[PDB]
Amino acid sequence: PECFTANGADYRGTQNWTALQGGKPCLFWNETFQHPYNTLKYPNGEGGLGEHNYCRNPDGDVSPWCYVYWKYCEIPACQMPGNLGCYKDHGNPPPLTGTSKTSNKLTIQTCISFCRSQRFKFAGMESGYACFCGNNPDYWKYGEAASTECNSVCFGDHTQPCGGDGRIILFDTLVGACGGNYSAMSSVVYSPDFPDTRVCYWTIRVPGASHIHFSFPLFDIRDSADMVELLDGYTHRVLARFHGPPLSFNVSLDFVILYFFGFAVLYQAVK
Ligand SMILES: *[C@@H]1O[C@H](CO)[C@@H](O)[C@H](O)[C@H]1NC(C)=O
Ligand SMILES: *[C@H]1O[C@H](CO)[C@@H](O)[C@H](O)[C@H]1NC(C)=O
Ligand SMILES: [Cl-]
Ligand SMILES: [Cl-]
Secondary structure, three states: OOOOOOOOOOOOOOOOEOOOOOOOEOOOOOOOOOOOOOOOOOOOOHHHOOOOOOOEOOOOOOOOEEEOOEEEOOOOOOOOOOEEEEEEOOOOOOOOOOEEEEOOOOOHHHHHHHHHHHOOOEEEEEOOOEEEEEOOOOOOOOOEEOHHHHOOEOOOOOOOEOOOOOEEEEEEOOOOOOOEEEOOOEEEEEOOOOOOOOOEEEEEEOOOOOEEEEEEEEEOOOOOOOEEEEEEOOOOOEEEEEEOOOOEEEEOOOEEEEEEOOEEEEEEEEO
16 A cells, blocks of 8 residues: 555655556656656655656645646555545445535545544545445445546545545545544554544554554654654553654554554554
């Protein structure tokens, strides 16, 4: 997995063809001087830009893209954990049965935060303005669709996609939550309200794990005043502190707490 954002702004991958099936080639960033995004404009790899033609999103568009006249990149690996894909929608029955609403200022988190309040574990955005909530495991009923088909911008934030009509983009409602209990072998903990701009803690507990490996593919804390803690859940000894993190570390427990005073922290446990 190579993005932990909703718009792939973190993506640094190799792909230089907009579509893996039937794609036009990407022009090189250094040769993009004519266009606003140039290796000159951003140096030493800022914005992921570099002497290459790989797909990138240096302007907070909804998704990675590259110049050609300019096109989105369809990348399977670029999908934030928490995002279940985007699926087709052919009307009733809808993919998420439970509830619906519409907002002119809708954003991925607003939709999530909304479904979370009803206690639905799944949320969907359609056409930029429609939010749907369900506990349906079969949101994939109508079939999986390419990611680019979900790129309609959220009306509340144009940096994020909210799906296109007949196309719905699915999020686990745990994303961005203020706290939570985590049981799976691995998952990602996102800063609260992620993807949109309180203090909260997350308890990660996996029975019979010898150790857990932590990872911070996204670290973006605004001030040293702000801080992220990791804590042994049994004793509450501090295993790490961070302010405004080397690539990984292993913790030899099955019970840890994440405390925050965005970021994405990926934990992958060993049984
Ligand atoms: C894509 O990038 C690779 C190196 O990562 C390069 O060898 C290749 O020529 C590029 N492909 C195209 C079609 O531009
Ligand atoms: C950009 O870098 C590529 C790869 O080294 C090179 O082929 C291209 O001509 C470069 N041009 C400039 C102006 O930096
Ligand atoms: Cl269709
Ligand atoms: Cl909350």
